[PDB]
């Protein structure tokens, strides 16, 4: 990170604020009128006192109450207008920033999410954006509303007697440098607090997602001690912020009151008095007194504003990170399905050992390739390379004769349907899980046909509402095989030219697996398929069986040929 300024963060924000200039312009006009009303109301002491209540004609006091009430009506109207317009613009800007942040996170590479924690990014969405919102609404309204008041008081004081606006001038730069120093301090503390809040969210999220492990292994004390640590650190950094703010405010108040001391001392001179009455000074010492109150408001709201300025700076740094590399530009309507690995070598980020070494694998159109091998040998990695979750080091992966990097990511991933090894469902009705991202495109007859092909219809008919049954947060209201079959139906609904089954039948019994296999045989007789299997009963009819070991292909063939040749596959078949 690298701090900027308040002006510099507003110069970064400006392209976002530009579409909403009208609200800002009317808010600025209303702010000017509000400051004018305040200053004019304070400058009523001069006629009230000089043109005495009984010394001079009461003509002033005849009309003065109506003037006060009218000024208050005008000030109220302009205060409403300025508050509402600035808050509307601020809400719009914060909404835009939140949406940009969400889209940016959705566009990051998978390797980014491997190295992160959900709590940190969730904190970026929740805590930092709420800091921007709170600051830019409340603290910004107050800052502008006291700055205008201070400027009005300065103008009035310089108008009545400039020989004291001179001390105001000589004291303004000191206040400016003090405020700038304290603001930099505040921005640093705020960034620290953002990191600590990310840690707090990560701690709570880890306890919540692993609740069953906490219970079963008795991890209550450890989780409680980790939350004690992080929450105490959050409190201590908040106290750092408070210490800075409450040591800064009295110093600035003292500097500002040196002006009041100077005005009293200067009036103590006889060479300055007798030039002005009692009433001009009735305005001037009333105005110094009434100036020290907006100063406090301004300084006191500075920490809250800087909590928003620091959050904005953090979001700006995030919003120009590198997203998923997408520099291909040829869409594909429907691939034939002819995927070919050509001498590819892949190393996971930060791992220094190849997960795959020299993979020369052809997956012809309409043929099924089965990857078998021991656990940890690199089958899910091949499946992850086909969908471009990770990018390879050497070699080429071609689809329809062109490298995968030549296509658009959306266009490419439209050609692949994947049942992953770790099934993830959503908190949605069974029907909105089978048709996850295409609920407007697939009818209920198509969804029921997919659910029937995945052997999921019998258990769905027994549920509370059928296809409208809400399943839990991650399908938690289902058994493991039922979650697997819903994921299978989700993949089978979309007639994608490439289907990848990454051990799709691990949680299924044998009869269920055989029914699903019977459906797959008829449905996918002409679609490229890649089955990753540990059970060799699932892949006996594959057109080519590929045995992976430590990341290299150790043999390839059909079931009958691989049963002869007495290789690795014959050993796997024998021990099963």
């Amino acid at each position: 990170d690298k701090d900027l300024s308040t002006w510099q963060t507003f110069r970064r924000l400006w392209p976002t604020i530009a579409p909403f200039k009208a609200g800002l312009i009317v808010a600025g006009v209303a702010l000017i009128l509000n400051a004018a009303s305040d200053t004019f109301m304070l400058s009523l002491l001069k006629p009230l006192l000089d043109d005495g209540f009984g010394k001079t004609d009461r003509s002033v006091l005849v009309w003065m109450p109506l003037v006060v009430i009218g000024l208050m009506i005008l000030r109220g109207i302009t205060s409403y207008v300025s508050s509402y317009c600035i808050s509307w613009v601020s809400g719009k800007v914060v909404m835009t920033m939140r949406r940009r942040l969400f889209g940016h996170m959705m566009g990051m590479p998978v390797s980014f999410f491997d190295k992160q924690s959900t709590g940190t990014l969730l904190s970026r969405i929740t805590y930092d954006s709420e800091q921007v919102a709170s600051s830019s609404s409340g603290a910004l309204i107050t800052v502008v509303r006291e700055g205008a008041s201070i400027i009005g008081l300065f103008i009035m004081m310089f108008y009545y007697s400039w020989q004291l606006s001179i001390i105001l001038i000589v004291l303004a730069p000191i206040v400016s440098i003090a405020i700038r120093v304290v603001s930099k301090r505040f921005r640093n503390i705020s960034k620290n607090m953002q990191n600590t809040m990310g840690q707090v969210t990560t701690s709570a999220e880890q306890m919540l997602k692993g609740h069953k492990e906490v219970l079963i292994f008795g991890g209550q004390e450890v989780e409680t001690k980790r939350f004690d640590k992080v929450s105490n650190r959050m409190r201590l950094q908040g106290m750092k912020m408070v210490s800075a703010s409450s040591i800064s405010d009295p110093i600035i108040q003292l500097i500002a009151s040196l002006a009041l001391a100077f005005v009293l001392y200067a009036a103590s001179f006889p060479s300055v008095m007798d030039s002005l009455t009692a009433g001009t000074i009735t305005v001037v010492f009333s105005s110094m007194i009434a100036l020290m109150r907006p100063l406090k408001s301004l300084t006191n709201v500075n920490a809250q504003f800087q909590r928003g300025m620091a959050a904005c700076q953090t979001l700006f740094t995030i919003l120009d990170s590198e997203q998923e590399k997408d520099e291909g530009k040829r869409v594909i309507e429907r691939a034939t399905g002819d995927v070919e690995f050509r001498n590819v070598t892949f190393t996971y980020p930060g791992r220094d050992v190849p997960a795959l070494r020299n993979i020369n694998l052809k997956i012809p159109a309409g043929k099924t390739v089965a990857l078998v091998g021991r656990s940890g040998s690199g089958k899910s990695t091949i499946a992850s390379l086909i969908t471009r979750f990770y990018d390879i080091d050497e070699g080429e992966i071609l689809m329809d004769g062109h490298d995968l990097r030549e296509y658009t990511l959306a266009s490419l991933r439209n050609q692949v349907a994947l049942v992953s090894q770790n099934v993830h469902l959503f908190n949605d009705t069974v029907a909105n899980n089978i048709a996850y991202a295409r609920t407007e495109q697939y009818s209920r007859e198509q969804i029921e046909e997919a659910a029937r092909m995945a052997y999921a219809m019998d258990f769905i008919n027994k549920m509370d509402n059928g296809l409208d049954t809400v399943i839990g947060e991650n399908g938690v209201l289902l058994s493991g095989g039922q979650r697997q079959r819903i994921a299978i139906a989700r993949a089978l609904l979309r007639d994608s030219p490439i289907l990848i089954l990454d051990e799709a039948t691990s949680a299924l019994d044998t009869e269920s697996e055989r029914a699903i296999q019977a459906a797959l045989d008829e449905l996918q007789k002409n679609r490229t398929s890649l089955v990753i299997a540990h059970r060799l009963s699932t892949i006996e009819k594959a057109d080519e069986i590929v045995v992976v070991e430590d990341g290299v292909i150790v043999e390839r063939g059909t079931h009958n040929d691989l049963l002869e040749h007495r290789g690795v596959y014959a050993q796997l078949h024998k021990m099963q």
């Epitope: 045995v547 070991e549 043999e555 390839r556 059909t558 040749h565 690795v568």
Partner: nanobody, 113 residues
Framework: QMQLVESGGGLVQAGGSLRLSCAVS????????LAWYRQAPGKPRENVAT???????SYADSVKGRFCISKDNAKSTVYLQMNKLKPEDTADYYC????????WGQGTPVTVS
């Protein structure tokens, strides 16, 4: 690309001994599966011996106890030692790398009187 060339024998007498070689290049030699196939003039290709990563050799029943398949990691070469040959063994011999759908050799005829 992986290529492999046999350097074998020609005509030998019955009951003799032969030793075939097949230098494998451009491969992860210590992991992949190597095998020896033979093709009689009329019969289709038949597996004869297979060796795997752990040097776990397997022999076709029709030839078990007479042949011996071994590989030298340093030289990147796989050997087929034949003992007590028979006229029925007269065929064209191929080395194979990683499976019946993998990479094949050009062939080396072997004749037994």
């Amino acid at each position: 690309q992986m290529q492999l060339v046999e350097s074998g024998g020609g005509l030998v007498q019955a009951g003799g001994s032969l030793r075939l070689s097949c230098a494998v290049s451009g491969s992860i030699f210590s992991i992949i599966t190597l095998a020896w196939y033979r093709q009689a003039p009329g019969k289709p290709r038949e597996n004869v011996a297979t060796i795997t990563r752990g040097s776990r050799t397997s022999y076709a029943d029709s030839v078990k106890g007479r042949f011996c398949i071994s590989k030298d990691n340093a030289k990147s070469t796989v050997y087929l030692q034949m003992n007590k040959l028979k006229p029925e063994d007269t065929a064209d011999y191929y080395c194979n790398a990683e499976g019946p759908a993998g990479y094949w050799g050009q062939g080396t005829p072997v004749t037994v009187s």
